[PDB]
Design a binder for these strands. Structure first.
Length: 103
DNA sequence: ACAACCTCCTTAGTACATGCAACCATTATCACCGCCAGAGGTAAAATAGTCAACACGCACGGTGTTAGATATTTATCCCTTGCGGTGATAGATT
């Protein structure tokens, strides 16, 4: 269920002809949003730029946010689900380009 | 000599458990009315004071002007959307 969600649920894009402009009449009304900005200590782990469902199976450890990823030094790093290859390999130096670090 | 036994005698000891809703009456009955207490009343003076007078003196509030803030307008910027290209996932195996 950590794979079988992220387009498996957006099948909702096939249930909406009944309700959200049934015809040909998109009207002026907004989407009215949610912003919280770079590089705030609250921002999600996705704000390190990732590699397919690596994003899902990392945030599933409740390490959803960059602020505590700073603890994950190459001595005890693995506690997470899956997260097995390109993600895990070398991103640790571009982590230091938005500006974080380990030690 | 007493013993309990036959009969219907009467006595009287009890009657399971949990909970919620409602409001608090009926009596008549001379208390007499006489006396006098300290004890109610109030006049005149203690324990002390009112508020009107003429002064005193101040605060507050509303009218006026000023200040600056705010909500508008404008326009800029970024973060987000949705699709797409193609990503190393998920997890089966080494």
């Amino acid at each position: 269920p950590e794979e079988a969600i992220r387009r498996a649920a957006t099948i909702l894009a096939e249930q909406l002809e009944a309700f959200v402009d049934l015809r040909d009449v998109r009207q002026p009304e907004v989407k009215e949003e949610k912003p919280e900005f770079d590089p705030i200590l609250l921002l999600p782990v996705d704000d390190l730029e990732l590699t397919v469902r690596s994003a899902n199976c990392l945030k599933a450890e409740a390490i959803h946010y960059i602020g505590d990823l700073v603890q994950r030094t190459e001595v005890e790093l693995l506690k997470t689900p899956n997260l097995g290859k390109k993600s895990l390999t070398e991103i640790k130096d571009v982590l230091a380009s938005r500006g974080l670090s380990l030690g």
